[PDB]
Amino acid sequence: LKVNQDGSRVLLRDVAKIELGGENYDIIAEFNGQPASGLGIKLATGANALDTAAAIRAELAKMEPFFPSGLKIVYPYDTTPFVKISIHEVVKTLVEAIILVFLVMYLFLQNFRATLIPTIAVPVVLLGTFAVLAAFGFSINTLTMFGMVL
Amino acid sequence: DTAAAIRAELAKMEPFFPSGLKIVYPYDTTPFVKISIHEVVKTLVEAIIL
Amino acid sequence: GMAYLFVRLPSSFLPDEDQGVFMTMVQLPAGATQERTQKVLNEVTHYYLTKEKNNVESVFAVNGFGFAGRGQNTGIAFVSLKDWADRPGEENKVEAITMRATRAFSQIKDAMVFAFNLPAIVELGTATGFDFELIDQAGLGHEKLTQARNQLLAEAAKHPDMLTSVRPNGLEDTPQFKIDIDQEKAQALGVSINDINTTLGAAWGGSYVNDFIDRGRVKKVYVMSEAKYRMLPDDIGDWYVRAADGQMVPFSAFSSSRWEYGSPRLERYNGLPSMEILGQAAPGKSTGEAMELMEQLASKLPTGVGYDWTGSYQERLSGNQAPSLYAISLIVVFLCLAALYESWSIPFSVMLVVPLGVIGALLAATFRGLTNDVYFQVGLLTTIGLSAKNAILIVEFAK
Amino acid sequence: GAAWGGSYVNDFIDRGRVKKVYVMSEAKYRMLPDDIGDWYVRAADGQMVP
Amino acid sequence: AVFVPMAFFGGSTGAIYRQSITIVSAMALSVLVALILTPALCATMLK
Amino acid sequence: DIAQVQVQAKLQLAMPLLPQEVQQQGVSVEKSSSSFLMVVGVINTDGTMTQEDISDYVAANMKDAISRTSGVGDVQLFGSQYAMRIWMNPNELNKFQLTPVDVITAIKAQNAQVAAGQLGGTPPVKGQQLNASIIAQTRLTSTEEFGKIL
Amino acid sequence: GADAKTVQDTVTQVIEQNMNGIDNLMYMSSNSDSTGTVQITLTFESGTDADIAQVQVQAKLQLAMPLLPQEVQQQGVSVEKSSSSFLMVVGVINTDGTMTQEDISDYVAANMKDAISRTSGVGDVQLFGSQYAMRIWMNPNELNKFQLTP
């Protein structure tokens, strides 16, 4: 900064403290009262949600191995498993609605092969409707899945 | 359609005008459209009637 | 009956669900600090830890960042509940968890904390739900806007009827430490006003100087001051600028200190100053009625003060919409029932089975506390299609 | 340049809305060729120069 | 005539009363399946 | 739509090569239609005001909203928006020994907003009770205030 | 550093009276906090391409970046796609080789964050902390001691 009269050097450390720290101390987060940062990703106004969050763990997966000692990942606030429940309890619902239809077809017609035509009918129709939404632009939504159930 | 909502924005402006500020309408294309419908759809009707 | 069991049945859009994930937001009064808000964020974190081990898997508190906006006055915890299997009863589900969470934070605290489940939805269409917005159309200022919004919040509160719950978005309105730099005093002693503005600016608020390289990656270099030399008003005079005549000059020489009342968040709408008004339609009335009994309150206000909606349908929900949809569903159904039939009688048979099935749909819905939302509206359409069936069979075979 | 043609200096606030500040000269000191010499620049030696 | 006309929706209730049609691709396929095939199977084999 | 961009940012590789006078002035890349449609005149009858007073109110209330409204290509103001207009007398400039450079410097100094920090700053001393924002030089407002510039 | 009034008419206002001639648009809102921050939301019609509209809204800006302070130019301006809500919120902590809530936010922002925002259609990433910076804390008593300023 300076060299005062008598040959003395004024340095930047002599006038100021110098540590390596954040550019913005306005916010600091805890995870169960433990010191932590994190990536709160927000969606992109038309993006494919669960597909986006699938490859959020693709990029993140290659990061894990080169971590310093102690650095571990944790998963609060996450939407992925709600999708996994609305398929394994809709496609479950689906199956129960067939199985029950099957026994009503037995109680009215005791013929085992007659309680079979309608059992092969609706599984086929379900599938063709997947192919129509694919051609029209739609996705496997929370809505359209309930549309197969109704 | 553009000129329809030119009077939409302008309509909300009118009430908060100082004293004397009044709008006037020279050079405007809207009413030429209104004539080419009420004299074509009129033409239409006369071509049936005849 | 079919009417009465429908007109009285309340309206909605989409049921708020247990999402295995909710959150609660924190907020402090007039210019609190990072230490003050963090005290509240700890108290919040423990209701979910110490008094909710069975339901909560984790917490992710964040000091000085609300969804209202930003600043060290706010906060937000991100809860991630234990899976659905381990949470059995109604008590252990978000509706009940956020119920006694809001109770505990309103009881043994002294700031403003809430809690709320997640609108699957987006951020809109609460139904019986509202968002007015006061606009300043004329050339009046923020000072005269503050009072006009206070007058519309007051008229709402002094005749509700058939009530209303109306509060501002977050203008709170806190003090600001102004410094008048008299310029005839400055250049007399020989100080440049350039030097003075980057002394006060780079010290108290920071100054992005230039980039350096840390460990391979380019980052920023900032300059400010140790925290203790910039906490209170008296530390302004500690900073000495240098003049052309190589001698020091304190800040108190050319500076004058005095407090003011300004806003920590100025909002605007369509290029003009604005203040958001977040109300909610009453437990009696519903939306179209509340909004229109808020419009005549905005017209009873001072000059140069209008209004505009945000953004609050623009075209949505049960109609408006619905009727016109059903309308055509009725104008067609008759045709089709004639494209394979002929007469002026056949289609009427099918066209009054409609209310047969519908009354049962209303009954069960009105019975166990549900509502006319989306899922009931589409269970209706299927029901007319399944009545169409059955009935048409009775017609087809008999004719 | 700033006298005869104008110079966009800096923005100010009029009645809430941000607008521009311009600098030029009264019209009469910039109409004809003879008014060029009316403008005096200052030199390093603190004396005027036409 | 009840489903697709109710999928003349509007606004943020856009893909809401829209994704009927999802229903109807399914209905016209149930007609198709019951106009093709079911006729066949019934004859092909029953008692 | 696509061509309105394209034509620009393939520009811009050129804005730095222009004068600083033109950069701060109104550059524009808009959609054209050699012709008007609506031409809304705006006059006064009772509380009379000038052809200058009206062009300001038109450009400071209604014009900003019109161009934004339903797909307007470009709006042409028929007049001009107000501005703090200063008419430098050259006889009362030589009288005090001065140039237009000293006038321009005086406005880029006294008429200027400054970003002073805040009491109880971003990284504070643990235990501070208040945090307020500091105001500094504010931008000037009226014709009187510009007249009292030193 | 800037206070609420400063950002209100040095950044916010300038961009707003230069936010026109844009295809499709219902309304515009904005915030201007005391933290020295501004954020405008331009909402569009339903089913409007967020791709074309992400541009459009900008470079119809920019005719305005030169009219802003040099402090804001060198700072982070941004035009991104929004979705008022997060989905994934990947926490990042330490267990064994303990490091601070500041040390972790640097490693998160200097290895994994840059790749996340880039990955499959992320609208915008919010860091929960801050990336490191050569932070200098100027002592004003050891500044007057050698006759010096910031």
Question: How many Cβ atoms sit within 10 Å of the Cβ of residue C375?
Answer: 17
Are D41 and F99 in contact by the 8 Å Cβ rule? The answer is: yes
- The CA distance from C7 to C14, in Å, is 19
DSSP, res D12: E
Tokens of C220: 């920023």
Q: What is the DSSP letter of G8?
A: I
Q: How far apart are CA C335 and CA C351, in angstroms?
A: 11
What whole-number distance in Å separates Cα of residue G109 and Cα of residue G116? Answer: 10
- Cα separation, G1 vs G19, in Å, equals 25
- Cα A87 to Cα A142: distance, rounded to the nearest angstrom: 9
Q: Which CATH number do you get for residue G5?
A: 3.30.70.1430
**Using CA atoms, how far apart are residues C94 and C76, in angstroms rounded to an integer?**
17
Buried b (16+ CB within 10 A) or exposed e, A42-76: bbbbebebeebbeebeebbeebeeeeeeebebbbb
| G59 touches F8 (CB < 8 A) | yes
Cβ(E4)–Cβ(A107) below 8 Å: no
User: Which of D21, D28, D31 to mutate to probe the F interface, most F CBs <10 Å?
Assistant: D21
Based on the number of CB atoms within 10 Å of its own CB, is C155 exposed (0-12), middle (13-18) or buried (19 or more)? middle
CA angle C52, C57, C60 (to 5 degrees): 95
C92 and C208 assigned to the same domain: no
Output b/e per residue, G89-106; b: 16+ Cβ within 10 A.
bbbbbbeeeebebbbbbb
User: A24 to chain F: which residues are within 8 Å by CB?
Assistant: 122
Domain of C278, CATH number, reads 3.30.70.1440
CB C206, CB C221: distance < 8 Å: no
Do chains E and C have 3 or more beta-carbon pairs under 8 angstroms?
A: yes
* Bond before A145 cis per omega within 30 degrees: no
User: For an interface test with F, which of B9, B12, B25, B33 has the most F Cβ atoms less than 10 Å from its Cβ?
Assistant: B9
Specify the resolution in Å. 3.2
Residues of A numbered 50-79 whose beta carbons fall under 8 angstroms of chain C's beta carbons: which are they?
74-79
d(C-alpha F26, C-alpha F102), whole Å: 26
Q: Do residues F139 and G7 make contact, with C-beta atoms less than 8 angstroms apart?
A: no
**What distance in Å separates the CA atoms of residue C202 and residue F121, rounded to the nearest whole number?**
12
Burial D23-43 (b: 16+ CB within 10 A, else e): bbbeeebbeeeeeeebbbebe
With tokens 């840059």, the residue in question is G114
Residue type at A51 in one-letter notation: D
> How many angstroms separate the CA atoms of C325 and C342, rounded?
26
Contact A28/C at CB under 8 A: yes
Q: Which two tokens stand for residue G68?
A: 């802003």
Same domain, residue pair C75 and C32: yes
The gap between the terminal CA atoms of chain B, to the nearest Å, is: 34
Q: What is the CA C82 to chain-centroid distance, rounded?
A: 27
Distances (CA, A) of C7 to C2, C288, C293, F38, F43: 9, 15, 21, 47, 52
**Could you give the angle at the alpha carbon of C330 between the alpha carbons of C327 and C336, nearest 5°?**
145
Cβ atoms of residues G146 and A2 within 8 Å: yes
Inter-CA distances, B48 with B43, B45, C76, C170, G65, Å: 9, 5, 71, 65, 63
Cβ contact G89:C78 at 8 Å: yes
Q: Which residue in this structure is represented by tokens 């924005």?
A: B9
Residue A30: beta bridge partners? Answer: A35
Residue listed under structure tokens 């059992």: A119
Q: What is the DSSP string of G81-97?
A: ---SSEEEEEEEEESSS
Cis-peptide, bond into residue G111, ω within 30° of zero: no
SS3 labels along chain C? CCCHHHHCCCECCCCCCCCCCCEEEEECCCCCCHHHHHHHHHHHHHHHHCCCCCCEEECCEEECCCCCCCCCCEEEEECEECCCCCCCCCCCCHHHHHHHHHHHHCCCCCCCCCCECCCCCCCCCCCCCCCEEEECCCCCCHHHHHHHHHHHHHHHHHCCCCCEEEEECCCCCEEEEEEEECHHHHHHHCCCHHHHHHHHHHHHCCEEEEEEEECCEEEEEEECCCHHHCCCHHHHCCCEEECCCCCEEEHHHHEEEEEEEECCECEEECCEEEEEEEEEECCCCCCHHHHHHHHHHHCCCCCCCEECCCCCCCCCHHHHHHHHHHHHHHHHHCCHHHHCCCCCCHHHHHCCCHHHHHHHHHHHHHHCCCCECHHHHHHHHHHHHHHHHHHHHHHHHHC
Range of the structural domain that residue C169 is part of? 124-173+271-318
Nearest residue to F111 via CA among G44, D13, A25, G115: D13
- Please answer whether residues A147 and A86 qualify as being in contact, where contact means their C-beta atoms are separated by less than 8 angstroms: no
DSSP assignment string, E6-46: GGG-BTTBTTTS----HHHHHHHHHHHHHHTTHHHHHHHS-
User: Do the chains contact at C233 and F61, CB–CB below 8 Å?
Assistant: no
Eight-state DSSP code of residue G108: I
How do beta strands G132-138 and C217-223 pair? parallel
Whose structure tokens read 């696509």? F2
* Concatenated DSSP letters of F17-82: GS-HHHHSS--------SS-S---EEEESSS---TTHHHHHIIIIIHHHHHHTTT------SS---
Q: Helix and strand tally (H, E) in chain F?
A: 7, 2
Rounded to 5°, angle at Cα B34 from B33 and B39: 100
Q: Of C37, C80, C78, nearest to C57 (Cα)?
A: C80
Which residues are CB-contacts of F91 (< 8 A; sequence separation ≥ 6)?
Answer: D29, D38
Amino acid identity of residue G63, one-letter, is L
Contact between C251 and C180 (Cβ < 8 Å)? no
Distant-in-sequence, close-in-space partners of C244: CB < 8 Å, separation ≥ 6: C190, C191
G-facing residues of D in 11-50 (CB < 8 A) are 11, 13, 17-18
Evaluated on CA atoms C279, C285, C291, C293, the torsion sign reads: negative
Q: How far apart are CA C74 and CA C36, in angstroms?
A: 10
Continuous H helices in A55-116: 56-63, 80-88, 91-108
Q: What technique solved it?
A: X-ray
Reference D8, options A2, A64, F84, A123; nearest CA is F84
Instruction: Count other C-beta atoms under 10 Å from residue G28's C-beta.
Output: 20
Closest C-alpha to G67, from G5, G4, G6, G18: G18
Residue with tokens 């206000």: C301
- In the stretch 112-141 of chain A, residues with CB closer than 8 A to chain C read none
Instruction: Determine contact: E19 vs chain G, CB below 8 A.
Output: no
Subunit contact F136:C181, Cβ cutoff 8 A: yes
For residue A100, the Cα-to-chain-centroid distance in whole angstroms is 33
Q: Please report the number of interchain residue pairs, chain A to chain G, with beta-carbon separation below 8 angstroms.
A: 233
Tell me which residue of C353, C355, C349, C338 sits closest to C398, measured CA to CA: C349
3-state SS, residue F86: strand
Q: What is the CA radius of gyration of chain G?
A: 20
Q: Cα separation of C254 and C249, whole Å?
A: 9
* Alpha carbons A28 and F102: distance in angstroms, whole number: 48
Q: Of 3.30.2090.10, 3.40.50.10190, 3.40.50.150, 3.40.47.10, which CATH number belongs to F80-150?
A: 3.30.2090.10
Strand partners, G132: A22
Q: Alpha-carbon distance G101 to G94, whole Å?
A: 9
Q: Which of C1, C250, C11 is nearest to C128 (CA)?
A: C11
C235 shares a domain with C98: no
Q: Does A129 touch chain E (CB under 8 A)?
A: yes
Burial class of C229 by CB neighbour count within 10 A (0 to 12, 13 to 18, 19+): buried
Between CA F97 and CA F30 the distance in angstroms is: 46
Distance CA E19, CA E10 (A): 12
Query: Token pair of C111, please?
Result: 């700031």
Among G112, E20, C123, CA closest to A136: E20
Nearest CA among E38, G55, C193, F54 for reference residue A120: E38
The SS3 call for residue A95 is helix
* Of C335, C374, C308, nearest in space to C131 by CA: C308
- Strand duo F83-86 + D17-23: pairing: parallel
Do C229 and C156 lie in one domain? The reply is no
CA distances from C314 to C136, F72, G45, G46 (A): 22, 22, 10, 11
Q: Count of B–F CB contacts within 8 Å?
A: 71
List own/partner pairs for B5-12 with CB under 8 A and 24 or more apart.
B5/F69, B5/F70, B6/F38, B6/F40, B6/F66, B6/F69, B6/F70, B6/F72, B8/F69, B8/F70, B9/F62, B9/F65, B9/F66, B9/F68, B9/F69, B10/F40, B10/F62, B10/F66, B12/C137, B12/C306, B12/C308
Answer whether F115 sits within 8 Å of G3, measured CB to CB: yes
